[PDB]
Amino acid sequence: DKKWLGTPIEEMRRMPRCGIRLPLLRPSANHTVTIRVDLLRAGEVPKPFPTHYKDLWDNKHVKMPCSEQNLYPVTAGSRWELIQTALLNKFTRPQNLKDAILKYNVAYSKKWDFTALIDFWDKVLEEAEAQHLYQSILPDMVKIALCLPNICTQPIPLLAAAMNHSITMSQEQIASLLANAFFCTFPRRNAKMKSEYSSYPDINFNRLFEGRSSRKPEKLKTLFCYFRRVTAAAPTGLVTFTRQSLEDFPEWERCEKPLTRLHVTYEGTIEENGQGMLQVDFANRFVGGGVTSAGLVQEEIRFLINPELIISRLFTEVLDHNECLIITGTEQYSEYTGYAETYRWSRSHEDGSERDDWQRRCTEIVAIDALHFRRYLDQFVPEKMRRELNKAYCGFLRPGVSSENLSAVATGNWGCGAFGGDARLKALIQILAAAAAERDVVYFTFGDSELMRDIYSMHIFLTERKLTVGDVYKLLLRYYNEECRNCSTPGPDIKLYPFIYHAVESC
Numbered sequence: 001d002k003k004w005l006g007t008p009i010e011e012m013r014r015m016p017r018c019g020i021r022l023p024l025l026r027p028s029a030n031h032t033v034t035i036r037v038d039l040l041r042a043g044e045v046p047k048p049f050p051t052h053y054k055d056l057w058d059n060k061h062v063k064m065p066c067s068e069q070n071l072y073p074v075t076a077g078s079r080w081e082l083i084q085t086a087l088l089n090k091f092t093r094p095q096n097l098k099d100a101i102l103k104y105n106v107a108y109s110k111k112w113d114f115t116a117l118i119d120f121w122d123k124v125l126e127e128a129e130a131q132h133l134y135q136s137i138l139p140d141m142v143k144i145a146l147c148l149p150n151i152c153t154q155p156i157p158l159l160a161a162a163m164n165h166s167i168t169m170s171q172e173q174i175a176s177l178l179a180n181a182f183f184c185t186f187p188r189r190n191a192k193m194k195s196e197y198s199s200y201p202d203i204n205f206n207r208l209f210e211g212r213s214s215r216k217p218e219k220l221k222t223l224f225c226y227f228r229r230v231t232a233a234a235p236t237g238l239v240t241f242t243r244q245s246l247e248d249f250p251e252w253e254r255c256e257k258p259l260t261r262l263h264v265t266y267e268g269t270i271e272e273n274g275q276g277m278l279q280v281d282f283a284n285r286f287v288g289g290g291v292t293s294a295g296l297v298q299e300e301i302r303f304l305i306n307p308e309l310i311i312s313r314l315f316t317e318v319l320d321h322n323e324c325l326i327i328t329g330t331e332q333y334s335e336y337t338g339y340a341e342t343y344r345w346s347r348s349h350e351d352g353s354e355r356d357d358w359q360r361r362c363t364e365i366v367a368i369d370a371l372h373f374r375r376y377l378d379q380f381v382p383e384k385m386r387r388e389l390n391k392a393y394c395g396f397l398r399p400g401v402s403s404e405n406l407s408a409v410a411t412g413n414w415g416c417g418a419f420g421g422d423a424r425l426k427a428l429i430q431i432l433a434a435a436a437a438e439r440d441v442v443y444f445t446f447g448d449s450e451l452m453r454d455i456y457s458m459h460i461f462l463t464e465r466k467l468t469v470g471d472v473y474k475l476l477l478r479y480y481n482e483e484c485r486n487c488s489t490p491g492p493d494i495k496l497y498p499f500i501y502h503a504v505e506s507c
């Protein structure tokens with residue numbers, strides 16, 4: 001049994017070498033840029049634009065902690081002044097940090113549990129580690145947090161439902177915002193019964209501090225690795241966050257495009273072995289999943305090792321069936337082993353990725369959320385197959401870019417862990433989406449050698465027989481009709497790939 005099958009990975013397209021020449025970075029109606037584009041220079045910390053803080057406190061922008069409209073009933077007082085007073089105290093014990101955060105979150109005094117924070121500090125860290133945390137890391141995090149109005153001078157628009165919009169901000173700007181999120185300073189993002197931001201993911205880090213899960217220390221180690229690095233030396237690059245909503249979806253049954261190339265392998269991971277490729281994040285509709293709470297699978301691990309991803313939660317509304325989020329430029333700061341209960345922070349990572357002409361690391365991640373299936377047969381219903389095709393296709397498609405300038409898609413068992421999908425069906429769905437979007441596929445089966453062989457055999461069978469995307473989708477519709485629709489038992493009598501082979505061969 002070979003470690004990989006299909007097209008050699010060397011034959012696949014990769015960034016930035018496959019990339020078209022970037023246009024000049026400029027703000028426009030569909031592109032927010034929070035730095036001085038005229039002053040952007042390699043190895044220099046970007047200058048925020050505008051020079052001085054400008055506030056927008058409304059339903060289309062982020063509500064900044066430093067806003068003069070961020071008030072707290074005392075008579076109205078200034079929450080930002082309160083944050084400053086609370087955080088500029090010295091911490092020598094974890095209760096100090098609890099008490100600090102709670103001074104400007106009084107309504108949550110009884111609801112927010114800090115057991116994981118207290119245990120990390122007192123019961124996991126060695127004396128010298130804790131001392132480095134409270135004497136150096138935390139005070140530095142406080143200072144970049146409180147620099148917010150000097151760093152994030154431009155209002156940040158919400159990437160709201162149905163918007164086709166990008167935000168390009170500096171890694172420094174992201175570091176300052178994430179320090180705020182750590183100290184739980186973002187207003188209107190806390191109430192269980194909130195309305196305005198009920199359609200947005202959590203941003204404040206309070207649920208990282210609750211409970212006694214053995215994985216919280218590992219999450220905190222991964223994040224403090226990030227925070228120690230970005231507060232000790234300011235990062236110099238940019239990161240772009242793009243919401244993409246597609247209106248026109250293919251008529252899959254009539255699609256005449258042929259399948260594209262496949263490399264499939266049971267070794268390697270998306271994040272290590274997909275350099276220069278469109279990397280898939282197996283997302284929740286609320287991007288980043290439980291990264292700021294208990295979650296610790298594929299999405300949350302990526303969000304932790306590349307923490308600049310987390311800030312997407314500040315401004316990215318829940319994804320609808322036709323939408324995705326594309327993040328370009330995030331930097332890897334940590335290495336890890338395992339997942340969930342076996343997840344461990346391994347060590348600090350020195351990202352060696354090149355930067356593009358906008359000083360973004362050459363790393364493009366798309367968050368596409370699969371459906372969470374409670375019953376196995378649910379996923380074969382045509383509207384659910386069509387839904388998955390269209391989600392993957394929106395994630396893969398780059399309107400107005402030629403195929404020769406599209407990197408391969410680096411993906412894997414999307415939706416087939418926590419979300420209960422079938423890997424063989426999802427693989428074919430992704431192969432069809434990629435084909436329609438004119439991209440090759442690099443599939444990581446994550447240890448499953450038999451799945452690698454099965455995907456390869458099917459793809460080569462379909463390719464050799466010259467079946468189009470439409471031809472293959474029609475075969476999915478036949479499997480649903482003959483084996484799933486009138487099936488009363490929990491599983492179908494015949495499996496999908498055997499069915500396809502028999503259906504094609506016998507005609």
Ligand SMILES: CCCCCCCCNc1nc2c(N)ncnc2n1[C@@H]1O[C@H](COP(=O)(O)OP(=O)(O)OC[C@H]2[NH2+]C[C@H](O)[C@@H]2O)[C@@H](O)[C@H]1O
Nearest residue numbers: 270282284289297298299339412413415416417418419446
């Ligand atoms: C193989 C079965 C057990 C492994 C589970 C470990 C979690 C990580 N999975 C993972 N990391 C990968 C990587 N580095 N490169 C390539 N493939 C990777 N995988 C594979 O992906 C499958 C699905 O992972 P999962 O995270 O459960 O994805 P979804 O089923 O889409 O779950 C979505 C929800 N999870 C959190 C997110 O926010 C959503 O709420 C896994 O089985 C595993 O083969």
